[PDB]
Backbone atoms as SQL, in Angstrom:
CREATE TABLE atoms (id INTEGER PRIMARY KEY, chain TEXT, resi INTEGER, resn TEXT, atom TEXT, x REAL, y REAL, z REAL);
INSERT INTO atoms VALUES
  (1, 'A', 1, 'UNK', 'N', 1.115, -1.138, 0.018),
  (2, 'A', 1, 'UNK', 'CA', 0.227, -0.132, -0.012),
  (3, 'A', 1, 'UNK', 'C', 1.098, 1.256, -0.325),
  (4, 'A', 2, 'UNK', 'N', 1.629, 1.233, -1.076),
  (5, 'A', 2, 'UNK', 'CA', 2.607, 2.804, -1.229),
  (6, 'A', 2, 'UNK', 'C', 3.407, 2.598, -2.660),
  (7, 'A', 3, 'UNK', 'N', 2.556, 2.874, -2.945),
  (8, 'A', 3, 'UNK', 'CA', 2.727, 2.445, -4.856),
  (9, 'A', 3, 'UNK', 'C', 1.686, 2.910, -5.360),
  (10, 'A', 4, 'UNK', 'N', 1.739, 4.129, -6.564),
  (11, 'A', 4, 'UNK', 'CA', 0.803, 4.491, -7.537),
  (12, 'A', 4, 'UNK', 'C', 0.528, 3.677, -8.385),
  (13, 'A', 5, 'UNK', 'N', -0.521, 2.772, -8.873),
  (14, 'A', 5, 'UNK', 'CA', -0.911, 2.056, -9.850),
  (15, 'A', 5, 'UNK', 'C', -0.929, 3.028, -11.040),
  (16, 'A', 6, 'UNK', 'N', 0.362, 3.040, -11.593),
  (17, 'A', 6, 'UNK', 'CA', 0.867, 3.313, -12.759),
  (18, 'A', 6, 'UNK', 'C', 1.900, 3.210, -13.674),
  (19, 'A', 7, 'UNK', 'N', 2.281, 3.334, -15.302),
  (20, 'A', 7, 'UNK', 'CA', 3.688, 2.753, -15.381),
  (21, 'A', 7, 'UNK', 'C', 5.087, 3.802, -15.404),
  (22, 'A', 8, 'UNK', 'N', 5.480, 3.023, -15.630),
  (23, 'A', 8, 'UNK', 'CA', 7.467, 3.367, -15.325),
  (24, 'A', 8, 'UNK', 'C', 7.090, 4.145, -13.767),
  (25, 'A', 9, 'UNK', 'N', 8.962, 3.916, -13.641),
  (26, 'A', 9, 'UNK', 'CA', 8.324, 4.547, -12.283),
  (27, 'A', 9, 'UNK', 'C', 8.796, 6.231, -12.755),
  (28, 'A', 10, 'UNK', 'N', 7.422, 6.820, -12.050),
  (29, 'A', 10, 'UNK', 'CA', 7.413, 8.391, -12.373),
  (30, 'A', 10, 'UNK', 'C', 6.765, 8.957, -10.602),
  (31, 'A', 11, 'UNK', 'N', 5.929, 8.186, -9.969),
  (32, 'A', 11, 'UNK', 'CA', 5.575, 8.349, -8.397),
  (33, 'A', 11, 'UNK', 'C', 5.020, 7.333, -8.100),
  (34, 'A', 12, 'UNK', 'N', 5.310, 8.042, -6.984),
  (35, 'A', 12, 'UNK', 'CA', 4.732, 6.256, -5.676),
  (36, 'A', 12, 'UNK', 'C', 4.669, 7.313, -4.469),
  (37, 'A', 13, 'UNK', 'N', 3.613, 6.487, -3.710),
  (38, 'A', 13, 'UNK', 'CA', 2.836, 7.015, -2.491),
  (39, 'A', 13, 'UNK', 'C', 4.588, 6.473, -1.473),
  (40, 'A', 14, 'UNK', 'N', 5.399, 7.884, -1.509),
  (41, 'A', 14, 'UNK', 'CA', 6.557, 7.463, -0.506),
  (42, 'A', 14, 'UNK', 'C', 6.131, 8.192, 0.714),
  (43, 'A', 15, 'UNK', 'N', 6.886, 8.459, 2.038),
  (44, 'A', 15, 'UNK', 'CA', 6.896, 9.258, 2.639),
  (45, 'A', 15, 'UNK', 'C', 7.176, 10.795, 2.421),
  (46, 'A', 16, 'UNK', 'N', 6.723, 11.843, 3.595),
  (47, 'A', 16, 'UNK', 'CA', 6.581, 13.299, 4.001),
  (48, 'A', 16, 'UNK', 'C', 7.418, 13.308, 4.869),
  (49, 'A', 17, 'UNK', 'N', 8.030, 14.172, 4.817),
  (50, 'A', 17, 'UNK', 'CA', 8.246, 14.877, 5.822),
  (51, 'A', 17, 'UNK', 'C', 9.056, 16.496, 5.907),
  (52, 'A', 18, 'UNK', 'N', 8.461, 17.562, 6.955),
  (53, 'A', 18, 'UNK', 'CA', 8.675, 19.331, 7.110),
  (54, 'A', 18, 'UNK', 'C', 10.294, 19.791, 7.012),
  (55, 'A', 19, 'UNK', 'N', 10.447, 19.585, 5.872),
  (56, 'A', 19, 'UNK', 'CA', 11.739, 20.030, 5.747),
  (57, 'A', 19, 'UNK', 'C', 12.175, 21.274, 6.456),
  (58, 'A', 20, 'UNK', 'N', 11.592, 22.919, 6.212),
  (59, 'A', 20, 'UNK', 'CA', 12.069, 23.608, 6.574),
  (60, 'A', 20, 'UNK', 'C', 10.312, 24.196, 7.180),
  (61, 'A', 21, 'UNK', 'N', 11.196, 25.413, 7.647),
  (62, 'A', 21, 'UNK', 'CA', 9.500, 25.739, 8.635),
  (63, 'A', 21, 'UNK', 'C', 8.816, 26.620, 7.480),
  (64, 'A', 22, 'UNK', 'N', 9.374, 27.629, 5.690),
  (65, 'A', 22, 'UNK', 'CA', 8.215, 27.753, 5.306),
  (66, 'A', 22, 'UNK', 'C', 9.155, 26.544, 4.062),
  (67, 'A', 23, 'UNK', 'N', 9.985, 26.551, 4.055),
  (68, 'A', 23, 'UNK', 'CA', 10.284, 25.914, 2.379),
  (69, 'A', 23, 'UNK', 'C', 11.762, 24.846, 2.382),
  (70, 'A', 24, 'UNK', 'N', 12.097, 24.262, 2.383),
  (71, 'A', 24, 'UNK', 'CA', 13.651, 23.788, 2.065),
  (72, 'A', 24, 'UNK', 'C', 14.118, 24.587, 0.864),
  (73, 'A', 25, 'UNK', 'N', 15.189, 25.186, 1.275),
  (74, 'A', 25, 'UNK', 'CA', 15.733, 25.630, -0.151),
  (75, 'A', 25, 'UNK', 'C', 17.515, 24.807, -0.959),
  (76, 'A', 26, 'UNK', 'N', 17.625, 25.321, -1.361),
  (77, 'A', 26, 'UNK', 'CA', 18.417, 24.880, -2.481),
  (78, 'A', 26, 'UNK', 'C', 19.499, 25.770, -4.075),
  (79, 'A', 27, 'UNK', 'N', 20.437, 25.710, -3.643),
  (80, 'A', 27, 'UNK', 'CA', 21.218, 26.734, -4.867),
  (81, 'A', 27, 'UNK', 'C', 20.403, 28.380, -4.297),
  (82, 'A', 28, 'UNK', 'N', 20.560, 28.370, -3.048),
  (83, 'A', 28, 'UNK', 'CA', 19.511, 29.947, -2.598),
  (84, 'A', 28, 'UNK', 'C', 18.186, 30.078, -3.220),
  (85, 'A', 29, 'UNK', 'N', 17.746, 29.603, -4.322),
  (86, 'A', 29, 'UNK', 'CA', 16.819, 29.456, -4.633),
  (87, 'A', 29, 'UNK', 'C', 15.750, 28.546, -3.784),
  (88, 'A', 30, 'UNK', 'N', 14.623, 28.998, -3.000),
  (89, 'A', 30, 'UNK', 'CA', 13.918, 28.342, -2.786),
  (90, 'A', 30, 'UNK', 'C', 13.087, 26.963, -3.485),
  (91, 'A', 31, 'UNK', 'N', 12.958, 25.960, -2.776),
  (92, 'A', 31, 'UNK', 'CA', 12.460, 25.297, -3.272),
  (93, 'A', 31, 'UNK', 'C', 10.646, 25.365, -3.029),
  (94, 'A', 32, 'UNK', 'N', 9.616, 24.480, -3.969),
  (95, 'A', 32, 'UNK', 'CA', 8.522, 24.731, -4.154),
  (96, 'A', 32, 'UNK', 'C', 7.867, 24.204, -3.652),
  (97, 'A', 33, 'UNK', 'N', 8.277, 23.051, -2.438),
  (98, 'A', 33, 'UNK', 'CA', 8.049, 21.551, -1.600),
  (99, 'A', 33, 'UNK', 'C', 8.653, 22.539, -0.832),
  (100, 'A', 34, 'UNK', 'N', 8.119, 22.061, 0.448),
  (101, 'A', 34, 'UNK', 'CA', 8.370, 21.981, 2.049),
  (102, 'A', 34, 'UNK', 'C', 8.226, 20.799, 2.319),
  (103, 'A', 35, 'UNK', 'N', 8.270, 20.087, 2.001),
  (104, 'A', 35, 'UNK', 'CA', 8.415, 18.697, 2.253),
  (105, 'A', 35, 'UNK', 'C', 9.284, 17.758, 2.000),
  (106, 'A', 36, 'UNK', 'N', 10.016, 16.796, 2.088),
  (107, 'A', 36, 'UNK', 'CA', 11.200, 15.677, 1.744),
  (108, 'A', 36, 'UNK', 'C', 10.935, 14.517, 2.038),
  (109, 'A', 37, 'UNK', 'N', 11.024, 13.029, 1.565),
  (110, 'A', 37, 'UNK', 'CA', 11.144, 11.543, 1.734),
  (111, 'A', 37, 'UNK', 'C', 12.514, 11.420, 1.048),
  (112, 'A', 38, 'UNK', 'N', 12.569, 10.647, 2.573),
  (113, 'A', 38, 'UNK', 'CA', 13.591, 10.184, 2.684),
  (114, 'A', 38, 'UNK', 'C', 13.437, 8.708, 1.908),
  (115, 'A', 39, 'UNK', 'N', 12.739, 7.891, 1.498),
  (116, 'A', 39, 'UNK', 'CA', 12.551, 7.214, 0.704),
  (117, 'A', 39, 'UNK', 'C', 12.824, 7.293, -0.065),
  (118, 'A', 40, 'UNK', 'N', 13.102, 8.072, -1.410),
  (119, 'A', 40, 'UNK', 'CA', 13.269, 8.332, -2.348),
  (120, 'A', 40, 'UNK', 'C', 15.282, 8.053, -2.278),
  (121, 'A', 41, 'UNK', 'N', 15.433, 7.975, -1.040),
  (122, 'A', 41, 'UNK', 'CA', 17.032, 7.925, -1.334),
  (123, 'A', 41, 'UNK', 'C', 17.209, 6.291, -0.193),
  (124, 'A', 42, 'UNK', 'N', 18.509, 5.691, 0.066),
  (125, 'A', 42, 'UNK', 'CA', 19.108, 4.512, 0.631),
  (126, 'A', 42, 'UNK', 'C', 19.340, 4.750, 2.586),
  (127, 'A', 43, 'UNK', 'N', 19.058, 6.172, 2.981),
  (128, 'A', 43, 'UNK', 'CA', 19.852, 6.940, 3.821),
  (129, 'A', 43, 'UNK', 'C', 18.373, 6.277, 5.206),
  (130, 'A', 44, 'UNK', 'N', 18.840, 6.642, 6.004),
  (131, 'A', 44, 'UNK', 'CA', 17.570, 6.522, 7.332),
  (132, 'A', 44, 'UNK', 'C', 17.771, 7.892, 7.890),
  (133, 'A', 45, 'UNK', 'N', 17.740, 8.938, 7.863),
  (134, 'A', 45, 'UNK', 'CA', 17.962, 10.115, 8.160),
  (135, 'A', 45, 'UNK', 'C', 18.730, 11.316, 7.648),
  (136, 'A', 46, 'UNK', 'N', 18.069, 12.451, 8.107),
  (137, 'A', 46, 'UNK', 'CA', 18.329, 13.551, 6.650),
  (138, 'A', 46, 'UNK', 'C', 19.749, 13.552, 7.211),
  (139, 'A', 47, 'UNK', 'N', 20.177, 13.819, 8.670),
  (140, 'A', 47, 'UNK', 'CA', 22.304, 13.881, 8.758),
  (141, 'A', 47, 'UNK', 'C', 22.487, 13.309, 7.204),
  (142, 'A', 48, 'UNK', 'N', 21.827, 11.820, 7.149),
  (143, 'A', 48, 'UNK', 'CA', 22.347, 11.229, 6.104),
  (144, 'A', 48, 'UNK', 'C', 22.278, 11.675, 5.203),
  (145, 'A', 49, 'UNK', 'N', 21.166, 12.009, 4.344),
  (146, 'A', 49, 'UNK', 'CA', 21.721, 12.924, 2.643),
  (147, 'A', 49, 'UNK', 'C', 22.404, 14.103, 3.138),
  (148, 'A', 50, 'UNK', 'N', 22.278, 14.789, 3.917),
  (149, 'A', 50, 'UNK', 'CA', 23.006, 15.950, 4.253),
  (150, 'A', 50, 'UNK', 'C', 24.339, 15.560, 3.974),
  (151, 'A', 51, 'UNK', 'N', 24.578, 14.583, 4.416),
  (152, 'A', 51, 'UNK', 'CA', 26.404, 13.499, 5.100),
  (153, 'A', 51, 'UNK', 'C', 26.952, 13.680, 3.759),
  (154, 'A', 52, 'UNK', 'N', 25.889, 13.207, 3.197),
  (155, 'A', 52, 'UNK', 'CA', 26.596, 11.836, 1.895),
  (156, 'A', 52, 'UNK', 'C', 26.955, 13.812, 0.643),
  (157, 'A', 53, 'UNK', 'N', 25.976, 14.604, 0.362),
  (158, 'A', 53, 'UNK', 'CA', 26.579, 16.007, 0.004),
  (159, 'A', 53, 'UNK', 'C', 28.188, 15.241, 0.150),
  (160, 'A', 54, 'UNK', 'N', 28.817, 15.504, 0.810),
  (161, 'A', 54, 'UNK', 'CA', 30.314, 15.947, 1.177),
  (162, 'A', 54, 'UNK', 'C', 30.829, 14.690, -0.166),
  (163, 'A', 55, 'UNK', 'N', 30.714, 13.783, 0.478),
  (164, 'A', 55, 'UNK', 'CA', 30.779, 12.913, -1.089),
  (165, 'A', 55, 'UNK', 'C', 31.443, 13.353, -2.650),
  (166, 'A', 56, 'UNK', 'N', 30.031, 13.871, -3.061),
  (167, 'A', 56, 'UNK', 'CA', 29.904, 14.272, -4.162),
  (168, 'A', 56, 'UNK', 'C', 30.152, 15.377, -4.750),
  (169, 'A', 57, 'UNK', 'N', 30.479, 16.262, -3.323),
  (170, 'A', 57, 'UNK', 'CA', 31.684, 18.173, -3.201),
  (171, 'A', 57, 'UNK', 'C', 32.495, 17.497, -4.135),
  (172, 'A', 58, 'UNK', 'N', 33.429, 16.401, -3.581),
  (173, 'A', 58, 'UNK', 'CA', 34.357, 16.459, -4.124),
  (174, 'A', 58, 'UNK', 'C', 34.732, 16.942, -6.058),
  (175, 'A', 59, 'UNK', 'N', 33.749, 15.536, -6.375),
  (176, 'A', 59, 'UNK', 'CA', 33.468, 16.630, -8.131),
  (177, 'A', 59, 'UNK', 'C', 33.577, 18.038, -8.371),
  (178, 'A', 60, 'UNK', 'N', 33.836, 18.665, -6.967),
  (179, 'A', 60, 'UNK', 'CA', 33.495, 20.364, -7.246),
  (180, 'A', 60, 'UNK', 'C', 34.619, 20.226, -8.537),
  (181, 'A', 61, 'UNK', 'N', 35.866, 19.942, -8.429),
  (182, 'A', 61, 'UNK', 'CA', 36.783, 20.026, -8.704),
  (183, 'A', 61, 'UNK', 'C', 36.890, 19.507, -10.566),
  (184, 'A', 62, 'UNK', 'N', 35.632, 18.872, -10.432),
  (185, 'A', 62, 'UNK', 'CA', 35.612, 18.816, -12.367),
  (186, 'A', 62, 'UNK', 'C', 34.001, 19.734, -12.292),
  (187, 'A', 63, 'UNK', 'N', 34.001, 21.031, -13.166),
  (188, 'A', 63, 'UNK', 'CA', 33.231, 21.854, -14.243),
  (189, 'A', 63, 'UNK', 'C', 31.713, 21.248, -14.883),
  (190, 'A', 64, 'UNK', 'N', 33.125, 20.394, -15.515),
  (191, 'A', 64, 'UNK', 'CA', 32.025, 19.565, -16.589),
  (192, 'A', 64, 'UNK', 'C', 30.683, 18.583, -15.683),
  (193, 'A', 65, 'UNK', 'N', 31.115, 18.251, -14.934),
  (194, 'A', 65, 'UNK', 'CA', 30.265, 17.295, -13.975),
  (195, 'A', 65, 'UNK', 'C', 29.122, 17.418, -13.238),
  (196, 'A', 66, 'UNK', 'N', 29.769, 19.082, -12.608),
  (197, 'A', 66, 'UNK', 'CA', 29.398, 19.329, -11.738),
  (198, 'A', 66, 'UNK', 'C', 28.241, 20.240, -11.738),
  (199, 'A', 67, 'UNK', 'N', 28.958, 21.155, -12.763),
  (200, 'A', 67, 'UNK', 'CA', 27.991, 21.898, -13.376),
  (201, 'A', 67, 'UNK', 'C', 26.451, 21.331, -14.042),
  (202, 'A', 68, 'UNK', 'N', 27.487, 19.820, -14.378),
  (203, 'A', 68, 'UNK', 'CA', 25.500, 19.179, -14.817),
  (204, 'A', 68, 'UNK', 'C', 25.234, 18.256, -13.768),
  (205, 'A', 69, 'UNK', 'N', 25.215, 19.005, -12.081),
  (206, 'A', 69, 'UNK', 'CA', 24.376, 18.537, -11.255),
  (207, 'A', 69, 'UNK', 'C', 24.375, 19.473, -10.343),
  (208, 'A', 70, 'UNK', 'N', 24.092, 20.416, -11.382),
  (209, 'A', 70, 'UNK', 'CA', 23.767, 22.052, -10.964),
  (210, 'A', 70, 'UNK', 'C', 21.656, 22.165, -10.864),
  (211, 'A', 71, 'UNK', 'N', 21.443, 21.507, -11.342),
  (212, 'A', 71, 'UNK', 'CA', 19.824, 22.299, -11.478),
  (213, 'A', 71, 'UNK', 'C', 19.444, 20.419, -10.668),
  (214, 'A', 72, 'UNK', 'N', 19.770, 19.644, -10.683),
  (215, 'A', 72, 'UNK', 'CA', 19.798, 18.109, -10.115),
  (216, 'A', 72, 'UNK', 'C', 20.418, 18.142, -8.593),
  (217, 'A', 73, 'UNK', 'N', 21.081, 19.369, -8.691),
  (218, 'A', 73, 'UNK', 'CA', 21.461, 19.219, -6.687),
  (219, 'A', 73, 'UNK', 'C', 19.888, 18.960, -6.224),
  (220, 'A', 74, 'UNK', 'N', 18.919, 19.940, -6.663),
  (221, 'A', 74, 'UNK', 'CA', 18.025, 19.576, -5.732),
  (222, 'A', 74, 'UNK', 'C', 16.337, 18.240, -6.285),
  (223, 'A', 75, 'UNK', 'N', 16.908, 18.613, -7.164),
  (224, 'A', 75, 'UNK', 'CA', 15.759, 17.196, -7.584),
  (225, 'A', 75, 'UNK', 'C', 16.657, 15.790, -6.882),
  (226, 'A', 76, 'UNK', 'N', 17.896, 15.519, -6.953),
  (227, 'A', 76, 'UNK', 'CA', 18.333, 14.655, -5.741),
  (228, 'A', 76, 'UNK', 'C', 18.386, 14.268, -4.967),
  (229, 'A', 77, 'UNK', 'N', 18.665, 15.599, -4.125),
  (230, 'A', 77, 'UNK', 'CA', 18.758, 15.189, -2.825),
  (231, 'A', 77, 'UNK', 'C', 16.907, 16.216, -2.191),
  (232, 'A', 78, 'UNK', 'N', 16.999, 17.190, -2.770),
  (233, 'A', 78, 'UNK', 'CA', 15.280, 17.289, -2.001),
  (234, 'A', 78, 'UNK', 'C', 14.131, 16.839, -3.365),
  (235, 'A', 79, 'UNK', 'N', 13.909, 15.681, -3.258),
  (236, 'A', 79, 'UNK', 'CA', 12.809, 15.556, -4.165),
  (237, 'A', 79, 'UNK', 'C', 11.285, 16.346, -3.965),
  (238, 'A', 80, 'UNK', 'N', 10.732, 16.401, -4.912),
  (239, 'A', 80, 'UNK', 'CA', 9.234, 16.957, -5.093),
  (240, 'A', 80, 'UNK', 'C', 8.147, 16.456, -4.542),
  (241, 'A', 81, 'UNK', 'N', 8.307, 16.193, -3.179),
  (242, 'A', 81, 'UNK', 'CA', 7.309, 15.291, -2.181),
  (243, 'A', 81, 'UNK', 'C', 5.718, 15.783, -2.367),
  (244, 'A', 82, 'UNK', 'N', 4.780, 15.316, -3.132),
  (245, 'A', 82, 'UNK', 'CA', 3.510, 16.240, -2.949),
  (246, 'A', 82, 'UNK', 'C', 2.084, 15.544, -2.880),
  (247, 'A', 83, 'UNK', 'N', 1.045, 15.231, -2.039),
  (248, 'A', 83, 'UNK', 'CA', -0.216, 15.231, -2.071),
  (249, 'A', 83, 'UNK', 'C', -0.782, 14.841, -2.768),
  (250, 'A', 84, 'UNK', 'N', -0.618, 13.686, -3.820),
  (251, 'A', 84, 'UNK', 'CA', -1.645, 13.861, -4.938),
  (252, 'A', 84, 'UNK', 'C', -2.964, 13.433, -4.360),
  (253, 'A', 85, 'UNK', 'N', -4.085, 13.319, -4.652),
  (254, 'A', 85, 'UNK', 'CA', -5.524, 13.175, -4.068),
  (255, 'A', 85, 'UNK', 'C', -5.532, 12.752, -2.453),
  (256, 'A', 86, 'UNK', 'N', -4.850, 13.344, -1.843),
  (257, 'A', 86, 'UNK', 'CA', -4.856, 13.446, -0.079),
  (258, 'A', 86, 'UNK', 'C', -2.911, 11.751, 0.228),
  (259, 'A', 87, 'UNK', 'N', -2.323, 12.058, -1.045),
  (260, 'A', 87, 'UNK', 'CA', -2.040, 10.758, -0.836),
  (261, 'A', 87, 'UNK', 'C', -0.283, 11.372, -1.416),
  (262, 'A', 88, 'UNK', 'N', 0.407, 11.218, -0.031),
  (263, 'A', 88, 'UNK', 'CA', 1.641, 11.636, -0.113),
  (264, 'A', 88, 'UNK', 'C', 3.024, 10.724, -0.790),
  (265, 'A', 89, 'UNK', 'N', 2.572, 11.880, -2.273),
  (266, 'A', 89, 'UNK', 'CA', 3.883, 10.955, -3.506),
  (267, 'A', 89, 'UNK', 'C', 5.243, 11.706, -3.759),
  (268, 'A', 90, 'UNK', 'N', 5.663, 11.019, -3.992),
  (269, 'A', 90, 'UNK', 'CA', 7.050, 11.702, -4.403),
  (270, 'A', 90, 'UNK', 'C', 7.619, 11.583, -6.026),
  (271, 'A', 91, 'UNK', 'N', 8.105, 12.627, -6.570),
  (272, 'A', 91, 'UNK', 'CA', 8.253, 13.351, -8.200),
  (273, 'A', 91, 'UNK', 'C', 10.277, 13.032, -8.845),
  (274, 'A', 92, 'UNK', 'N', 9.991, 11.207, -8.758),
  (275, 'A', 92, 'UNK', 'CA', 11.280, 11.307, -9.441),
  (276, 'A', 92, 'UNK', 'C', 11.891, 12.408, -10.389),
  (277, 'A', 93, 'UNK', 'N', 13.401, 11.738, -10.399),
  (278, 'A', 93, 'UNK', 'CA', 13.770, 12.809, -11.540),
  (279, 'A', 93, 'UNK', 'C', 13.578, 12.603, -12.804),
  (280, 'A', 94, 'UNK', 'N', 13.148, 13.343, -13.735),
  (281, 'A', 94, 'UNK', 'CA', 13.239, 12.913, -15.467),
  (282, 'A', 94, 'UNK', 'C', 14.423, 12.457, -16.274),
  (283, 'A', 95, 'UNK', 'N', 14.441, 11.760, -17.320),
  (284, 'A', 95, 'UNK', 'CA', 15.482, 11.165, -17.176),
  (285, 'A', 95, 'UNK', 'C', 16.427, 12.231, -18.182),
  (286, 'A', 96, 'UNK', 'N', 15.561, 13.340, -18.795),
  (287, 'A', 96, 'UNK', 'CA', 16.788, 14.595, -18.638),
  (288, 'A', 96, 'UNK', 'C', 17.219, 15.278, -17.885),
  (289, 'A', 97, 'UNK', 'N', 17.121, 15.734, -16.566),
  (290, 'A', 97, 'UNK', 'CA', 17.650, 16.156, -14.862),
  (291, 'A', 97, 'UNK', 'C', 18.782, 15.138, -14.989),
  (292, 'A', 98, 'UNK', 'N', 18.863, 14.122, -15.334),
  (293, 'A', 98, 'UNK', 'CA', 19.697, 12.908, -15.091),
  (294, 'A', 98, 'UNK', 'C', 20.603, 12.678, -15.756),
  (295, 'A', 99, 'UNK', 'N', 20.098, 13.273, -17.005),
  (296, 'A', 99, 'UNK', 'CA', 20.850, 13.096, -18.647),
  (297, 'A', 99, 'UNK', 'C', 21.836, 13.957, -18.302),
  (298, 'A', 100, 'UNK', 'N', 21.444, 15.053, -17.852),
  (299, 'A', 100, 'UNK', 'CA', 22.470, 16.319, -17.865),
  (300, 'A', 100, 'UNK', 'C', 23.806, 15.871, -17.545),
  (301, 'A', 101, 'UNK', 'N', 24.101, 15.484, -16.906),
  (302, 'A', 101, 'UNK', 'CA', 24.886, 14.673, -15.725),
  (303, 'A', 101, 'UNK', 'C', 25.726, 13.294, -16.251),
  (304, 'A', 102, 'UNK', 'N', 25.319, 12.637, -18.054),
  (305, 'A', 102, 'UNK', 'CA', 25.344, 12.085, -18.550),
  (306, 'A', 102, 'UNK', 'C', 26.073, 12.178, -19.792),
  (307, 'A', 103, 'UNK', 'N', 25.803, 13.562, -19.719),
  (308, 'A', 103, 'UNK', 'CA', 27.244, 14.081, -21.257),
  (309, 'A', 103, 'UNK', 'C', 28.244, 14.157, -20.608),
  (310, 'A', 104, 'UNK', 'N', 28.552, 15.285, -19.983),
  (311, 'A', 104, 'UNK', 'CA', 29.868, 15.240, -19.158),
  (312, 'A', 104, 'UNK', 'C', 30.469, 14.234, -18.944),
  (313, 'A', 105, 'UNK', 'N', 29.995, 13.523, -18.078),
  (314, 'A', 105, 'UNK', 'CA', 30.393, 11.507, -17.547),
  (315, 'A', 105, 'UNK', 'C', 29.390, 10.706, -18.474),
  (316, 'A', 106, 'UNK', 'N', 29.387, 10.712, -19.719),
  (317, 'A', 106, 'UNK', 'CA', 29.499, 9.446, -19.857),
  (318, 'A', 106, 'UNK', 'C', 29.763, 7.970, -19.701),
  (319, 'A', 107, 'UNK', 'N', 30.530, 8.134, -19.045),
  (320, 'A', 107, 'UNK', 'CA', 31.068, 6.535, -18.270),
  (321, 'A', 107, 'UNK', 'C', 30.584, 5.657, -17.661),
  (322, 'A', 108, 'UNK', 'N', 29.466, 6.558, -17.327),
  (323, 'A', 108, 'UNK', 'CA', 28.239, 6.587, -16.001),
  (324, 'A', 108, 'UNK', 'C', 27.269, 5.925, -16.415),
  (325, 'A', 109, 'UNK', 'N', 27.191, 5.627, -17.444),
  (326, 'A', 109, 'UNK', 'CA', 26.478, 5.264, -18.361),
  (327, 'A', 109, 'UNK', 'C', 25.316, 4.477, -17.858),
  (328, 'A', 110, 'UNK', 'N', 26.188, 3.342, -16.861),
  (329, 'A', 110, 'UNK', 'CA', 25.331, 2.628, -16.218),
  (330, 'A', 110, 'UNK', 'C', 25.839, 1.260, -15.701),
  (331, 'A', 111, 'UNK', 'N', 26.910, 1.887, -14.830),
  (332, 'A', 111, 'UNK', 'CA', 28.531, 0.850, -13.809),
  (333, 'A', 111, 'UNK', 'C', 27.948, 1.725, -12.471),
  (334, 'A', 112, 'UNK', 'N', 28.842, 0.643, -11.629),
  (335, 'A', 112, 'UNK', 'CA', 29.276, 1.198, -10.414),
  (336, 'A', 112, 'UNK', 'C', 30.465, 1.604, -10.185),
  (337, 'A', 113, 'UNK', 'N', 30.632, 2.948, -10.718),
  (338, 'A', 113, 'UNK', 'CA', 31.523, 2.987, -10.451),
  (339, 'A', 113, 'UNK', 'C', 31.782, 4.516, -10.163),
  (340, 'A', 114, 'UNK', 'N', 31.068, 5.266, -9.879),
  (341, 'A', 114, 'UNK', 'CA', 30.256, 6.317, -8.690),
  (342, 'A', 114, 'UNK', 'C', 29.056, 6.066, -8.829),
  (343, 'A', 115, 'UNK', 'N', 28.625, 5.422, -7.669),
  (344, 'A', 115, 'UNK', 'CA', 26.980, 5.523, -7.197),
  (345, 'A', 115, 'UNK', 'C', 26.567, 6.960, -5.845),
  (346, 'A', 116, 'UNK', 'N', 27.727, 6.531, -5.529),
  (347, 'A', 116, 'UNK', 'CA', 27.250, 7.225, -3.938),
  (348, 'A', 116, 'UNK', 'C', 27.232, 8.717, -4.634),
  (349, 'A', 117, 'UNK', 'N', 27.938, 9.321, -5.655),
  (350, 'A', 117, 'UNK', 'CA', 28.076, 10.255, -6.418),
  (351, 'A', 117, 'UNK', 'C', 26.521, 10.792, -7.526),
  (352, 'A', 118, 'UNK', 'N', 26.788, 9.067, -8.249),
  (353, 'A', 118, 'UNK', 'CA', 25.534, 9.672, -9.241),
  (354, 'A', 118, 'UNK', 'C', 24.090, 9.665, -8.652),
  (355, 'A', 119, 'UNK', 'N', 23.592, 7.994, -7.487),
  (356, 'A', 119, 'UNK', 'CA', 22.422, 7.817, -7.442),
  (357, 'A', 119, 'UNK', 'C', 21.775, 8.303, -7.149),
  (358, 'A', 120, 'UNK', 'N', 21.412, 7.911, -9.394),
  (359, 'A', 120, 'UNK', 'CA', 20.630, 8.692, -9.881),
  (360, 'A', 120, 'UNK', 'C', 19.690, 7.145, -11.083),
  (361, 'A', 121, 'UNK', 'N', 19.164, 6.839, -11.128),
  (362, 'A', 121, 'UNK', 'CA', 18.110, 5.763, -11.861),
  (363, 'A', 121, 'UNK', 'C', 18.874, 5.939, -13.624),
  (364, 'A', 122, 'UNK', 'N', 19.103, 5.355, -14.291),
  (365, 'A', 122, 'UNK', 'CA', 19.648, 5.692, -15.889),
  (366, 'A', 122, 'UNK', 'C', 19.147, 4.373, -16.439),
  (367, 'A', 123, 'UNK', 'N', 19.477, 3.328, -16.157),
  (368, 'A', 123, 'UNK', 'CA', 19.046, 2.065, -16.344),
  (369, 'A', 123, 'UNK', 'C', 17.635, 2.002, -17.288),
  (370, 'A', 124, 'UNK', 'N', 16.485, 2.257, -16.003),
  (371, 'A', 124, 'UNK', 'CA', 15.131, 2.865, -16.060),
  (372, 'A', 124, 'UNK', 'C', 15.092, 3.887, -17.101),
  (373, 'A', 125, 'UNK', 'N', 13.615, 4.270, -17.262),
  (374, 'A', 125, 'UNK', 'CA', 12.983, 5.217, -18.302),
  (375, 'A', 125, 'UNK', 'C', 11.648, 5.850, -17.775),
  (376, 'A', 126, 'UNK', 'N', 12.309, 7.043, -16.951),
  (377, 'A', 126, 'UNK', 'CA', 11.131, 7.363, -15.903),
  (378, 'A', 126, 'UNK', 'C', 10.084, 8.344, -16.442),
  (379, 'A', 127, 'UNK', 'N', 11.004, 9.015, -17.439),
  (380, 'A', 127, 'UNK', 'CA', 10.192, 10.418, -18.492),
  (381, 'A', 127, 'UNK', 'C', 8.355, 11.062, -17.473),
  (382, 'A', 128, 'UNK', 'N', 9.468, 11.996, -16.980),
  (383, 'A', 128, 'UNK', 'CA', 7.929, 12.918, -16.228),
  (384, 'A', 128, 'UNK', 'C', 7.261, 12.752, -16.628);
């Protein structure tokens, strides 16, 4: 009882918790959502999600991939978790948003070379 009857990875009845008093912020610009779904990740707490960021942060060295996860930096850690018809669901990242990183770093087409940093689905086609 936690998965909307739809096709392709797009939405699912996941969890949802209040991030900030008004609404979490990403790269200065505040997000349109004030909730978050830890289920979107494989962590066990908010601290874990924000902690993992440090790992990917190292990628800063590479501007090609760095700017690639700029827009996804929000759809990767702060997923748009809203309530559809009264059901707390999550909004997975679109193939495009995730493709932004594929452009610069194609070597990660679908290999376990940098999962901790990737943490993005590619083998499947979500297509928002």
